[PDB]
Scaffold this active site. Structure first.
Site, PDB file in Angstrom:
ATOM      1  N   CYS A 119       3.839  -0.377   0.857  1.00  0.00           N
ATOM      2  CA  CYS A 119       4.482  -0.477  -0.453  1.00  0.00           C
ATOM      3  C   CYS A 119       4.000  -1.742  -1.167  1.00  0.00           C
ATOM      4  O   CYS A 119       3.875  -2.796  -0.546  1.00  0.00           O
ATOM      5  CB  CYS A 119       6.007  -0.467  -0.272  1.00  0.00           C
ATOM      6  SG  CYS A 119       6.935  -0.266  -1.738  1.00  0.00           S
TER       7      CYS A 119
ATOM      8  N   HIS B 127      12.097  -2.137  -5.173  1.00  0.00           N
ATOM      9  CA  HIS B 127      12.718  -1.566  -3.974  1.00  0.00           C
ATOM     10  C   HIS B 127      12.926  -2.615  -2.894  1.00  0.00           C
ATOM     11  O   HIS B 127      13.712  -2.398  -1.963  1.00  0.00           O
ATOM     12  CB  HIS B 127      11.819  -0.438  -3.400  1.00  0.00           C
ATOM     13  CG  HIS B 127      12.533   0.515  -2.499  1.00  0.00           C
ATOM     14  ND1 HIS B 127      13.641   1.234  -2.900  1.00  0.00           N
ATOM     15  CD2 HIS B 127      12.329   0.829  -1.194  1.00  0.00           C
ATOM     16  CE1 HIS B 127      14.063   1.977  -1.891  1.00  0.00           C
ATOM     17  NE2 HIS B 127      13.252   1.790  -0.862  1.00  0.00           N
TER      18      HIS B 127
ATOM     19  N   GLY C  53       4.779   0.191   5.382  1.00  0.00           N
ATOM     20  CA  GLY C  53       4.351  -1.174   5.089  1.00  0.00           C
ATOM     21  C   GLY C  53       3.400  -1.300   3.922  1.00  0.00           C
ATOM     22  O   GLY C  53       3.039  -2.408   3.546  1.00  0.00           O
TER      23      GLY C  53
END
Ligand code: A1EGN
Ligand code: A1EGN
Lengths: 302, 302
Positions: free
Chosen positions: B145, B41, B143
């Site tokens: 991820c 992503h 944040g």
């Protein structure tokens, strides 16, 4: 979002843990710079553990009586000394993994992470609070003596707890890193009882704010209360009194949620008088009092 | 004694965490040997996040489009590739802190530790279980991820989870370290819903054994039940069915406590039909299902 009992990352403390042996007595130590800190109880033999005179026991020892193992390396002890209930073993090697650190004593109601260790080997990390009766409801097995509790502020490890022993009720007692016990306990293998405990009110309120931040609102209500009429009801249920300083500390959470502190106190009063009627808050069916206002902000805002 | 939600010491994972940036998109990566693993992503711009075609997005990138920061050091990317939903960024430096490690996929009902990280910096560690609907009830902010979940067996870190996103209900979804999602989710910023969840029965029983080991016995009873007549009652309350393998796994706890598994099932049946009448087990007012038989043994026996 979401809300867990979160500990600080423990790596900076793991690189400090060693094993200390004196005779056949063994436990964990904390190696910072060229000193190893550990419970002085380690200089007790089995028959010494009941009623020791530590000054006597320590004068009968020399450096060579202390075996310090850091992983696969033996550290040679070049000096020993007592500070209250902690032994300080000077070693000929400074720990290359020493983090920036401080010895701080904490207050009842504050939280810290525990790195449970066995024979100098870290096994687990969990978050705990210092109860009003200066015990902690820890999780420890035989061999855990010397495990440390700590907080991390930026890059600096603030050590606040060294584990010593389990009380008959199954709760845990120990000292700050200067060797001073939390609460009215002594380092001898005798049955000792903790005083009565109370619920940490400001933390419960902080946790109710966490719940609101995460979308749990069912316990809220349009009522409000006064600081005195809340305490009058909280004492009944074995809750610490709320002070104006607690309301100030809760200010930021009040702002982020727009729920006045005294309004949240109104909901707490109702929960104590009516229970939860089979509902839950943040996944729990009772009121949680081991999160401080600061823990809530750290996890719920950033 | 005592019973906490305990995570594994996190140091071995902390020394692997880095920050990965592509454009203005940033998140966490995992640096092992000379590869950095992170959610793909990260190659999405804001307008790409809704409906990306990742093969398209990645062909339009080169190594110099990826900024990897390991503390204060920038690692130069010398190769990039996709494996399912994970990006692999080859770097010119092998991580000197690489632990022995394995990529393992876990099953619903198993537990793992999470090291929540932000901009490549570890912030907290907690224990979580994989739910039956392949989500986890984590605690994460923007944040997070790329944060990893893991277990430690001896000296070997088994990585089992890479965090990707939060679902509308507030639960969390991600992949194993080969980039394969847990559950029927996809890495696009669209609303997706988890299937229904059940209570992990074997874990609840494991936790009831923990309680007995720690002196909580009030829920026990002289009755017993059959495996089938228990499941008939557990389905009603949204509990997973118990199998003979679950009884075998619970064998050791049965032995250490001397309480036959089917007897403990009898107590569980009663707790589900009567509730707890305002009492608690191991400090909790509801039945806890995020401790496995193995977690119980590790904490309650050694
Ligand atoms: C060979 N050898 C033997 C040794 C024995 C030792 N004694 C303790 N070891 C210890 O681990 N725990 C303990 C802490 N937390 C949880 C626990 O849980 C167990 C208990 C029930 O459930 C699981 C246990 C203790 O309580 N003690 C007593 C104790 C220790 C002190 F420091 C003190 F000042 C006074 C004491 F009374 C030591 Cl320190 C070193 C040794 N080497
Ligand atoms: C500049 N910049 C912007 C960025 C935005 C990004 N997007 C996410 N960042 C993120 O942190 N969380 C998140 C995870 N856990 C808990 C959370 O809690 C928050 C939310 C409510 O409470 C607090 C949030 C997400 O859900 N996403 C969406 C998302 C991420 C994916 F990987 C995916 F495949 C699909 C998605 F839909 C990323 Cl990855 C990088 C970025 N750089």
């Amino acid at each position: 979002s979401g809300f867990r009992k979160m500990a600080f990352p423990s790596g900076k403390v793991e690189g400090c843990m060693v094993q200390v042996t004196c005779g056949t007595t063994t436990l964990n130590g904390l190696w910072l710079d060229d000193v190893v800190y550990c419970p002085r109880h380690v200089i007790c033999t089995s028959e010494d553990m009941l009623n020791p005179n530590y000054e006597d026991l320590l004068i009968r020892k020399s450096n060579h009586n202390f075996l310090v193992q850091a992983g696969n390396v033996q550290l040679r002890v070049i000096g020993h000394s007592m500070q209250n209930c902690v032994l300080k073993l000077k070693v000929d090697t400074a720990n290359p993994k020493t983090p920036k650190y401080k010895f701080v004593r904490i207050q009842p109601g504050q939280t810290f992470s525990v790195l449970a260790c066995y024979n100098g080997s870290p096994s687990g990390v969990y978050q705990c609070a210092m109860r009003h009766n200066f015990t902690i409801k820890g999780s420890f097995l035989n061999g855990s003596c010397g495990s440390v509790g700590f907080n991390i502020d930026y890059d600096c490890v603030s050590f606040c707890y060294m584990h010593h022993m389990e009380l008959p009720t199954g709760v845990h007692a120990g000292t700050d890193l200067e060797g001073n016990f939390y609460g009215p306990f002594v380092d001898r293998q005798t049955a000792q009882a903790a005083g009565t405990d109370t619920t940490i009110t400001v933390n419960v309120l902080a946790w109710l704010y966490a719940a609101v931040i995460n979308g749990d609102r069912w316990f809220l209500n349009r009522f409000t209360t006064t600081l005195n009429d809340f305490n009058l009801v909280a004492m009944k249920y074995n809750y610490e009194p709320l002070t104006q300083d607690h309301v100030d500390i809760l200010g930021p959470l009040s702002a982020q949620t727009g729920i006045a502190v005294l309004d949240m106190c109104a909901s707490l009063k109702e929960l104590l008088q009516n229970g939860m009627n089979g509902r839950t808050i943040l996944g729990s069916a009772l009121l949680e009092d081991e999160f401080t206002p600061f823990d809530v902000v750290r996890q719920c805002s950033g």
